[PDB]
Design a protein around this ligand. Structure first.
Ligand SMILES: O=C(O)C(C(=O)O)c1ccccc1
Length: 105
C-alpha cells in the first residue's frame, strides 16, 4: 500500500518537491514519489543530483501505471508494485541520474 510508504509524499507540487530536495545536506539519490501534477493516474519520482557542472539539482521522472497492473518508467523494465520499482532503482542507475539512496528528509 503505497500510501503507507515513508517515501510517498502524495499530492505535493513539483516546486515543493524541489524545495525539499534542494538542500545542501542531501546526497545524490535523495528521493521522493508524488503524484504527477497533470497526468491522472501517473506518479513522479523526484531525485536529487549533484555534479561540478550543475552543482545540486533535481530530476523528475514519470512513473506510468498499467490497468494490466505494472508500474514503469521505461516500458522495457516493468514491476508489479511501486515498492519493487523503488527497490530495483536503489540498486541500478540505468537511465536515471543516480541510483535511489535516501528518502527525502
Ligand atoms: O506530470 C507532470 O505534470 C510532471 C510533474 O508533476 O512535475 C512531470 C513531468 C515530467 C516527468 C515527471 C513529472
Amino acid at each position: 500500500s503505497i500510501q503507507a510508504e515513508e517515501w510517498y509524499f502524495g499530492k505535493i507540487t513539483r516546486r515543493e518537491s524541489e524545495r525539499l530536495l534542494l538542500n545542501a545536506e542531501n546526497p545524490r539519490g535523495t528521493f521522493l514519489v508524488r503524484e504527477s501534477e497533470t497526468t491522472k493516474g501517473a506518479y513522479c519520482l523526484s531525485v536529487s543530483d549533484f555534479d561540478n557542472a550543475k552543482g545540486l539539482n533535481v530530476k523528475h521522472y514519470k512513473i506510468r501505471k498499467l490497468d494490466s497492473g505494472g508500474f514503469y518508467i521505461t516500458s522495457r523494465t516493468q514491476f508489479n508494485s511501486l515498492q519493487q520499482l523503488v527497490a530495483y532503482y536503489s540498486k541500478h542507475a540505468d537511465g536515471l541520474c543516480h541510483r535511489l539512496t535516501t528518502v527525502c528528509p
